[PDB]
Design a protein around this ligand. Structure first.
Ligand SMILES: NC(=O)c1ccc[n+]([C@@H]2O[C@H](COP(=O)([O-])OP(=O)(O)OC[C@H]3O[C@@H](n4cnc5c(N)ncnc54)[C@H](O)[C@@H]3O)[C@@H](O)[C@H]2O)c1
Ligand SMILES: NC(=O)c1ccc[n+]([C@@H]2O[C@H](COP(=O)([O-])OP(=O)(O)OC[C@H]3O[C@@H](n4cnc5c(N)ncnc54)[C@H](O)[C@@H]3O)[C@@H](O)[C@H]2O)c1
Ligand SMILES: NC(=O)c1ccc[n+]([C@@H]2O[C@H](COP(=O)([O-])OP(=O)(O)OC[C@H]3O[C@@H](n4cnc5c(N)ncnc54)[C@H](O)[C@@H]3O)[C@@H](O)[C@H]2O)c1
Ligand SMILES: NC(=O)c1ccc[n+]([C@@H]2O[C@H](COP(=O)([O-])OP(=O)(O)OC[C@H]3O[C@@H](n4cnc5c(N)ncnc54)[C@H](O)[C@@H]3O)[C@@H](O)[C@H]2O)c1
Lengths: 315, 315, 315, 315
């Protein structure tokens, strides 16, 4: 009956598109929160009018007070920095972001614990796989109520590139990128299908070659960098990805999506967050799916988790 | 710019739902044709009013003249009988339909050749794999411009049942049923994925058993009969399935869908229509996808094709 | 988070389309209830498969027990007869329906009181303005939680016909038909706009004439009869209209819709249900809007209410 | 069948949201064109991935060459400046934009005439009512194939503000703001309706007062300024508005929308563009609607057109 209340903790580039999309889908009431005075109210005022064009009925208001987290059903955290100062577009790496972004999670976690402990939480702030757990530790929310953005966005790239080469509906391509969001992303060739058919079949048929696939792989891992060098840290697709995830929770869709979640033994790991297929429903994370990886694949997973494990010690 | 013109050749149970769905999706102008006097004009009047509730702008008119096929962009043929005089609901079989519906194809084909030779055609009339080729022969349209309903409907059942057992979004289950629509339908266990993951992984995990899967199989094959025995020849899912197909042609979606199409050597067969994955886009059938079947799977394919072959001889 | 639970009390022609539309819009879980054995389980099985084609996640099950009303969020009552034994299609009149459908309301009301006292209820069963108050009396629900189908359906016809004549989007025509659903329906010329512009301006411009408008009026009033005479009691538009209403409650849309509601002094009447603009939101009927009618318009209102009053006495 | 080809001539803030929205609605293939090297390709790459999340199939590519206008079905012109240099947020006025924006139209018109003379054109660049005609003069396209952004955006504000005060679905409020986009906007109190009911009725009922309406009026005329002072020149709602207009053309919706169009006698004016209700269909502007204004209202219209007429002489 009541509309879900959605709090965008951070109203920069991603938060802007997220608000637009939420109204388009009439998904819930929106608070656009930020540290920067004024900006949020303006983005919110602008976004609010689209209610007419979209046949929607969602309030959109800006905020500068953590008090607006009260009674939140969904909280989305994009608070932080894209770049590190003194670095050039070339040297862009998500790693160099522990610097300006670690403290922010501590703060935000405190307020969440006090204002909306029953909310479902999605963390985006880089380096996500580390930040997600930090926020989880400070917010006190249950393990099934917090996830980080990753697979959905990374696979959307791989899915889309394959679809262009094969000339089919992008949604018709399925793929899995697990372990961690970042340069050690694990792309699983064996788990790629097109129209439900193993990719190998298309290679045997010479519709696509192993090399063009490898090319596509490279382009997938380095896409954020390619975009950073062309314009700025990606924000449109990140937005759609997060919202596909939020929507699955709010509408209880029970979609299978690859998100950063807490491992309790899966893949032989514990006390850390890693990307893997999950099911997002109205109870939050309904189920975590463990891919039955082979020897070589496990090795890759292990390496990505170590990269997350290493930065963790950096605080 | 102009709206597509869609002609439903047959306006019974399936035609009724198709028209409703077309207005919902603002998919194109609709002519509801039938030989029964007046009935279609009423269904059409009723349906036209939903343009208001759906924010659409599609005309819906009834017809009793083949003249209305003129300039059609899409023609959907459901004309015929759902079952067979002197027959009980328990002995229901789409095969006893050669009696009831052969001649109708010849008549309709002639008018199509005359009024809309460039239309995309979808045949539903059972037994579909035979009927579609008959309409193909008398209408004269190119092989990439005509398909029969089958896989989309059969897999929706298999996908749905599995999804109930696994507790995931039904769209997240992918599966293939090929060869023929009917009792000899080929259900390919090896081609089933959930969230892009091989079904075998969920069986290994004890999420679903081989036995439960086989039961789901029997259910899938006997679904039409189960519904006939509870109410009547199924028509809501058949309609949605057809519209998914028509929509992919009208909007140039390029979805991979399993439909009855003319085989020119694939799977070792020719001069006959059989169900297989294919791509539907703005040009019609953009590509036929031949599954690289193993020896066991090929055997079953050939048995389904043989049933189609047998009925074809009954002329 | 949880999906709304929707119970269709009656699963004939209108119930069938309602269930289809609910899946299309992923609006909630559906129970298709009826007294006819087996029929609803079949319609429900058929309908459930469309979850795949529609990217939805709504359960659809049949029922023959009032037990399934338990915890319903929305209940829609279509239970009854569409016409009347020994009567011809030409003498069709929603009034001869007191015979056919009074007692059914008492029975249903009792079970509602027992199983789902907090549900939002929509009555369709003709003659609706009488039936809705009967169900209101026996079910015990609050006045803001029960309405009858009428204005939304009647105006969709008037809006559509005008839109055809003027060549505009049907949603761009706005109009009001109040008082009662039936032959005494009050069509208010003064309250007609096109793109927010008074209809009179288009008449002054010679875009439509007074005569054409009056013809459109006769058509609007006699639409059900025209369709009965061509096919059967209308059900596709009635269904879309009901779902528009249910959707505005479930998604908290706060749309202004004309429904049958309990009058407590508005228009000079009380202790009776009559059609008038109202707002449907998450709380149910959020506000009843009383049109500031002139002397001529009031006269007509009173005549419609008197017809409802007369039939009420036939107990 | 084929997808519409849509060229965004200008890829700044508005162009960015427009591309996002087009993919969401699967409305057509997109070229994101601009003078600034690199930026466009990046925004395009980013936007392209959302195809997966949105079930869409639209190509999104960047461009720096006017050659990409070839075969365009829709061209949208946002090319230019928001601000004037040396001016503060306080002194922001759309007038001070003849400066940096006039020449741009000449250029773009030449290419349009040579690359896509059959396209439908929407102009946004401020001051729109002047720029639209300039572009019309240089492009040579027919009067029914070119319009400027105005009413839709300005009314969305008025509609939304009224809806908040009255607590109804924003789409349920209808209003007209004609003459010119800018500080002399003509807000027509007499043409405001809520749920199709004259606003006066709600004032008589004391649901809203004349003063709060006047307040709302002020806020409507100064909204861009309020947003400019809070963040930046509005871009989200502008985007949705333009796209509602584009969509009506591509899907042949025949919606009634207030856009800047060429007057040939209407309201007693000629050889100039002014905002007024129009119908946008697949032939472009199907009809221009002349509001039958009264003496006071005409005076206001005349004043807004003079403001457009004055700036025209400024070149
Ligand atoms: N997980 C992923 O796949 C992925 C993808 C893209 C970006 N990201 C990350 O997401 C984050 C957001 O990116 P963006 O494009 O929105 O950048 P952005 O700079 O445009 O927006 C971030 C906003 O956070 C605000 N902020 C700072 N402290 C805050 C506080 N504690 N509370 C609320 N807001 C606060 C800043 O004002 C800033 O506007 C970045 O750190 C980026 O690295 C992650
Ligand atoms: N392909 C599939 O997977 C599948 C699934 C379900 C049903 N079907 C088949 O589709 C057919 C139609 O099903 P339905 O439920 O709509 O049946 P229906 O009986 O309700 O409708 C059939 C309509 O065709 C009409 N008709 C007869 N001859 C005609 C002619 N020459 N031109 C136009 N109309 C004519 C009948 O009057 C009737 O209205 C049946 O044969 C059924 O077996 C196929
Ligand atoms: N409000 C309106 O504007 C409007 C418009 C059209 C029709 N109607 C009315 O709605 C009613 C239903 O229309 P329909 O076309 O779906 O009719 P229908 O005959 O196809 O369906 C009515 C169903 O109710 C069932 N039924 C009988 N008693 C029942 C009970 N106690 N509990 C549950 N089900 C029971 C019947 O078996 C049947 O399936 C009719 O009275 C019709 O006049 C109203
Ligand atoms: N009509 C309205 O209701 C309305 C509302 C808002 C904004 N606007 C106007 O729309 C225009 C666009 O606003 P914006 O927010 O997109 O600003 P923006 O600066 O972010 O985008 C404009 C882009 O035009 C580009 N450009 C310059 N010359 C070009 C050329 N000839 N070809 C292609 N691109 C070129 C610039 O690189 C710039 O990025 C502004 O002039 C603004 O005043 C009108």
């Amino acid at each position: 009956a009541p509309k879900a209340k959605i709090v965008l903790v951070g109203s920069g580039m991603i938060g802007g598109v997220m608000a637009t999309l939420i109204v388009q889908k009439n998904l819930g009431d929106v608070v656009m929160f930020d540290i920067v005075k004024n900006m949020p109210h303006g983005k919110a005022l602008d976004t609010s009018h689209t209610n007419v064009m979209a046949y929607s009925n969602c309030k959109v208001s800006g905020s500068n007070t953590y008090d607006d987290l009260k009674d939140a059903d969904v909280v989305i955290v994009t608070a932080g920095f894209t770049k590190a100062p003194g670095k050039s577009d070339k040297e862009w790496n998500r790693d160099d972001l522990l610097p300006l972004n670690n403290k922010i999670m501590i703060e935000i976690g405190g307020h969440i614990k006090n204002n909306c402990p029953n909310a479902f939480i999605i963390v985006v702030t880089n380096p996500v796989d580390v930040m997600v757990q930090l926020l989880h530790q400070h917010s006190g929310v249950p393990k099934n109520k917090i996830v980080g953005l990753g697979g959905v966005l990374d696979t959307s790239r791989l899915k889309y590139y394959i679809s262009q080469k094969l000339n089919v509906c992008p949604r018709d391509v399925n793929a899995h990128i697990v372990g961690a969001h970042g340069n050690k992303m694990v792309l699983l060739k064996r788990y790629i299908t097109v129209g439900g058919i193993p990719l190998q079949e298309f290679i045997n048929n010479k519709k696509i070659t192993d090399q063009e696939l490898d090319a596509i792989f490279d382009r997938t891992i380095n896409t954020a960098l390619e975009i950073v060098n062309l314009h700025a840290s990606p924000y449109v697709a990140p937005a759609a990805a997060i919202i596909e995830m939020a929507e699955s929770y709010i509408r209880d869709l029970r979609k299978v999506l690859i998100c950063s979640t807490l491992l309790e033994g899966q893949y032989g790991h514990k006390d850390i967050f890693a990307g893997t297929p999950l099911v997002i429903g109205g109870n939050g994370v309904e189920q975590v799916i463990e891919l039955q990886l082979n020897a070589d694949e496990k090795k890759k997973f292990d390496e990505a988790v170590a990269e997350t494990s290493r930065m963790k010690a950096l605080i």
